[PDB]
Amino acid sequence: SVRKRKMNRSSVGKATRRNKDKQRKINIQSNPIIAANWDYSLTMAQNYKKLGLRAKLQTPAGGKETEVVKKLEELASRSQSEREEEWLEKLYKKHGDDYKKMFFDKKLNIYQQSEGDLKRRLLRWKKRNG
Amino acid sequence: VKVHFDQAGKKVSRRNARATRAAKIAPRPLDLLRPVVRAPTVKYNRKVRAGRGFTLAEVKAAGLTAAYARTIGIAVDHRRQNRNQEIFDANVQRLKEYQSKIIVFPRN
Amino acid sequence: TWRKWNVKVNHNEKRYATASAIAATAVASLVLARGHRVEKIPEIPLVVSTDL
Amino acid sequence: SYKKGAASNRTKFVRSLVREIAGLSPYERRLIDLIRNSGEKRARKVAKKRLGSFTRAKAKVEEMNNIIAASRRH
Amino acid sequence: GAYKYLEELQRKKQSDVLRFLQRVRVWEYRQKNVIHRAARPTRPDKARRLGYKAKQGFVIYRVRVRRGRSLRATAEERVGRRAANLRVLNSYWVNQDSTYKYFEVILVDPQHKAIRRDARYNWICDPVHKHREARGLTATGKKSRGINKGHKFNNTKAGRRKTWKRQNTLSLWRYRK
RNA sequence: AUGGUGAAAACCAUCUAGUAGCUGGUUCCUGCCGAAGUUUCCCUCAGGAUAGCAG
RNA sequence: CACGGACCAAGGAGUCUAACGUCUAUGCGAGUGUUUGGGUGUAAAACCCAUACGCGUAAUGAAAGUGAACGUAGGUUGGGG
RNA sequence: GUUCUUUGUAAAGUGCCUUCGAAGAGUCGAGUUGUUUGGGAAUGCAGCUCUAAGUGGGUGGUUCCAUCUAAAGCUAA
RNA sequence: GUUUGACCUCAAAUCAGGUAGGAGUACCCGCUGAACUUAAGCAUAUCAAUAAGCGGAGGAAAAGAAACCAACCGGGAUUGCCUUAGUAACGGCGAGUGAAGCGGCAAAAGCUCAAAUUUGAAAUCUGGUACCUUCGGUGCCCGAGUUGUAAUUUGGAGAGGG
C-alpha cells in the first residue's frame, strides 16, 4: 500500500492500540447484586442458570435461590401548593361541605371546577390540616 | 466469488455482542417476550411458531396496558389481528404466566 | 482463496473414530507401539483418584 | 376500512363552495352545453375520452346534472 | 382552518380563478432569474404538507426547468449547486408554461441554530443528508428509483445494483453445500 | 470500445489473460496388456451420430 | 524436405472451482445429511443440538381420478448352494 | 451510594359515562413515445396530452369477500 | 397633507456570525453507458440494469414501521444468511435467463408532521448585550413570527367534559 508504507517508514510512530482482551471479558454494570454474584469464568447463559434468572424467553435454537431472594428483598421497600391550600381555606370557611354551593360560587371558585375536583382536594387538605 | 471464511469469526462476534447486551441489560433476558402464532398457507398451518408481537386485545385481556407492556419487555404488534380463538387463549395464558414470573424493580 | 480448505465429515463416522481411539488407549501394547514409555505404569487403562 | 370516509358536513360544504367560486374548466364548459344540446349520451362519450376511465365519467356527468338542475330552478 | 379551503381550491387547476393566477405568475417568474428566492411559498398549504415551518432557517427557492431524466429532480439538483450550505427537503409544482416548468423547492439551513435545537428538524443536520437530491433520497428521487412495497417493485426494492451483485456473484461456504 | 495525451494523421492507459476452423513446447523409472487404419445414414465438407479392433 | 538447437545455471506448462455423472471405500439404513445457525470450548480447532429443509421411502393418467393377495405376494421349468 | 433543592389549584396514566370527531392532487389514473427486466396481466421509471373521488381509494381471491390507507418525514442492530 | 408616515420589494457594506468547494474512494447511494465475445450473418436474446466517465455520502450507506404478503385452525417494519430452487416463469424453448410468498435463523424499536382555534391574553424562537456554576443558564433589549411559532393529536385512533 501507498500510505501504509510511509507510516512504517516515518519517525512519527503508529497509534498502537491493544484492545483485544477487553472485547471478551466485559464487566457487568447495571446491577450491584449481580456485580457481586457473577462468575466471569462462566459464560453469559451459564451465569444466568447459576443465579436462577432466565436468559432467554423463547425456545432456543440448538441444545444445552441464593441470589433471587436478595432481589425480592429490595422489592419489599406529594403535597399541595401554598396558593392551593390558602384558596381551599377560603372555600371551607365560607361554605363548609356544601359542594353544590361551592361550585356555583363565582368569587372564590374562579376556575369552574366540578364537585369531584374540589372535594378531592379538600380531602387532601383535611389530611395535612383539620 | 465470495467465500465465508469468517463463519467461526462471526459466531464469536455474535456471541460477544450478546455478552455485551447481557452486561448492559443486566437482569433482563436479552430478548422480548414474543407471542405464539399459527403459520400461514395449507402446507404449514399445522406448525405453530413465534409471532412478532401480541395485540392490544391480548394485552388488554391479560391485565396490563399497551404502552406499559413495552416497558416490561413485551413485544406489541398493532397490525396483527385476533381471528383465531385458540391462539388468543394460548397467548393470554403465556402473558399471565410471564406476569407471575416478572419482578419489576422500583424507581427510587 | 476459494480452495476447499475445510472437510465435511459424517457425524456418525466422526463419532466412530473417537470411540475407536478411546478403545485403543486401553490396550497397553498399542500404546507402547504408538510411543509412550508405559513400562513402569501400574495398570491400563490408568485411573487416578478424583483428588488429582 | 372501518374509517372508510363518512359524509362530513364541513367537507361537503367546502367542495360545493369551491365548485361554484372556481367556475368551470374548458372541457366542463363545453360539456354542460353538450348536455343541453346533444343529450347525456354524447356527453358521456366526450367525458370518457377526456378523463381516464368510464367510471370517472359517470360521476362527472352526474355532478354536471346536479349543478345545472340546482342553478336554473333554485 | 383555511388549509382545507386552499387544499380544495388547488384541485380545480384549470378553473377560472386559478387559470388567471397562472398566466400572471408565468409572466412574472420569466422576468426574474432562472434560480431565485421567493420570500413566501405561493401554495403554502402544499409547503406545510411537505414539511415547511414559517420560521428562521427555512428557505423557498423558485426554480425554472426546460421541457422534454426527470425535471423535478433536475430542479432540486440545480438549487443544490447554487445553495450548497442548505439541504433540500422537498419540492412541489406551482406553475407551468409550454416551454418551461416551475417548482418551489423548500430548503433547510442545518447551520442555523434554530434548526440545530428543535428535535423535529435537527435530523437534517446529520452529515448523512448532504445532497439528498444528488442521491435520489427526496420524494421525487425515491419515486424514480421505483422504491415502494409490492409485487411491482420486486427487482428494484433494496437497490437495483445491490440485488444484481447478490444474484450474479457465486457464494461458497467453508463446508461446501 | 471507453477515457486521455500530442499534433504543418498519431500515441498512452484500461475493457482484455479479447476471441485461434491453429503454431511451437509440455518435466521421473520399471513392469504388464496393446490397437486401429474403418462399416452404414445423419448429407459429406467441419464436428460428430454408430459398428469394428483393445480393456 | 522444413522448423527448433552457440554453451551453461535458474525459472518454466493438464492447475483450481462449480455444475453433473462413473466406479471403489467408509458410515448408517427406509431412512439419511451436526458445522444457516444456537450452546460450549484449553478458542478460526474440537465437542453437543432445537426447529425446519434437502433427497429417498407406493404407483397407474391428457383436463376430471383411482390404487396394487385368486396367492408359501404363483403355476411350471431351470437355476450357486 | 452521598446530599443540596423539590410547587404549580403542575404534569400525566388508567376504567366507566356523556358530546364530538378534519388523515396529504398537476397526485391517483388514462393514451403514447423511450428506457428497465428472464417479468408472460408493459413490471418499474421518465418524457408529453388530459386529468379524479370521500358510507372514499389502492391491491388480490370466485356474484361477493379478504386485505391495507398512497401522493410527507425520522430511526439504531 | 404639493408635507409626513406605514408596509412590501429591490439594495448595500473590507459590518457580525456562519457555511459550500478540494483530497481520499474498498464498500454504499444516484446519473450516464460501450465493444471484443454467445446462438451461423447480427436488430432483440447476449457481453451488460457491466468497464470507463459524472455526481454525492458515511462508519457503514441504503432500506424501513405497510395504500404489504396471502387464501390458510392467517402472517405482520426493514436488512442479511440457510432454504424454497435451478422451481414458477420467460427465452427463432435454443447460448439459456432466473425470482418471490411461506419455513429455519441472525438482529430486533419504534415513532414525528400535515390535518378542526392558545384565542381568558405567541404560551415559541433568533440575535445583541449584561452576568453566571459556559458543549450552556438567567435578566434586559432587538428582531422573526399571526401568510402561524409553542402546548395538546397521528387511526393502535383521538379530543371535550363528568
Swiss-Prot record, chain A:
Regions of compositional bias (Basic residues) in chain numbering: 1-8, 15-25
Compartments, as annotated in UniProt: Nucleus, Nucleolus
UniProt miscellaneous comment: Present with 2860 molecules/cell in log phase SD medium.
Protein name: Nucleolar protein 16
Coiled coil: none
Organism: Saccharomyces cerevisiae (strain ATCC 204508 / S288c) (Baker's yeast)
Gene Ontology BP, a term: rRNA processing
InterPro entries, alphabetized: Ribosome_biogenesis_Nop16
Keyword terms of this UniProt record: Nucleus, Phosphoprotein, Ribonucleoprotein, Ribosome biogenesis, rRNA processing
Entry similarity comment: Belongs to the NOP16 family.
Pfam families: Nop16
UniProt keyword annotation of Ribonucleoprotein present: yes
UniProtKB/Swiss-Prot annotation, chain C:
Protein origin, superkingdom: Eukaryota
Annotated localization: Cytoplasm; Nucleus
PTM comment: N-terminally acetylated by acetyltransferase NatA.
Signal peptide start and end residues: none
Coiled-coil features, chain-numbered ranges: none
Family: Belongs to the universal ribosomal protein uL4 family.
Note: There are 2 genes for uL4 in yeast.
Complexes and interactors: Component of the large ribosomal subunit (LSU). Mature yeast ribosomes consist of a small (40S) and a large (60S) subunit. The 40S small subunit contains 1 molecule of ribosomal RNA (18S rRNA) and 33 different proteins (encoded by 57 genes). The large 60S subunit contains 3 rRNA molecules (25S, 5.8S and 5S rRNA) and 46 different proteins (encoded by 81 genes). uL4 is associated with the polypeptide exit tunnel. uL4 interacts with its chaperone ACL4 and the nuclear import receptor KAP104.
Domain notes: The eukaryote-specific C-terminal extension harbors a nuclear import signal and delivers the ACL4-uL4/RPL4 complex to the pre-ribosome, triggering uL4 release from ACL4 and incorporation into the 60S ribosomal subunit.
Protein name, UniProt field: Large ribosomal subunit protein uL4A
Gene source species: Saccharomyces cerevisiae (strain ATCC 204508 / S288c) (Baker's yeast)
Residues included from the entire protein: 105 to 156 of 362
Swiss-Prot record, chain D:
Keyword Cytoplasm appears in the UniProt entry: yes
GO cellular component terms attached to this protein's record: cytosol; cytosolic large ribosomal subunit
Location in or out of the cell: Cytoplasm
One annotated GO molecular function: RNA binding
UniProt keywords, alphabetically: Cytoplasm, Ribonucleoprotein, Ribosomal protein
Major site of localization recorded for this protein: cytoplasm
UniProt-listed GO biological process terms: cytoplasmic translation
Subunit structure: Component of the large ribosomal subunit (LSU). Mature yeast ribosomes consist of a small (40S) and a large (60S) subunit. The 40S small subunit contains 1 molecule of ribosomal RNA (18S rRNA) and 33 different proteins (encoded by 57 genes). The large 60S subunit contains 3 rRNA molecules (25S, 5.8S and 5S rRNA) and 46 different proteins (encoded by 81 genes).
Protein name, UniProt field: Large ribosomal subunit protein eL36B
Taxonomic source organism: Saccharomyces cerevisiae (strain ATCC 204508 / S288c)
Residues of the full protein shown: 27 to 100 of 100
From Swiss-Prot, chain E:
Record keywords, A-Z: Cytoplasm, Ribonucleoprotein, Ribosomal protein
A GO term, aspect molecular function: structural constituent of ribosome
Protein's cellular compartments: Cytoplasm
Domain of life: Eukaryota
Keyword Membrane: no
Biased composition (Basic residues): 142-158
Subunit-structure text: Component of the large ribosomal subunit (LSU). Mature yeast ribosomes consist of a small (40S) and a large (60S) subunit. The 40S small subunit contains 1 molecule of ribosomal RNA (18S rRNA) and 33 different proteins (encoded by 57 genes). The large 60S subunit contains 3 rRNA molecules (25S, 5.8S and 5S rRNA) and 46 different proteins (encoded by 81 genes).
Origin species: Saccharomyces cerevisiae (strain ATCC 204508 / S288c) (Baker's yeast)
Gene3D superfamilies tied to this protein: Ribosomal protein l15e (3.40.1120.10)
PROSITE patterns per UniProt: RIBOSOMAL_L15E (PS01194)
A cellular-component GO term for this protein: cytosolic large ribosomal subunit
Disordered: annotated span: 137-158
InterPro entries reported in the protein's UniProt record: Rbsml_eL15_core_dom_sf, Ribosomal_eL15, Ribosomal_eL15_CS, Ribosomal_uL23/eL15/eS24_sf
Family, per entry: Belongs to the eukaryotic ribosomal protein eL15 family.
Main location: cytoplasm
GO BP terms in the entry: cytoplasmic translation
Pfam families: Ribosomal_L15e
More info: There are 2 genes for eL15 in yeast.
Signal peptide: none
Name by which UniProt lists this protein: Large ribosomal subunit protein eL15A
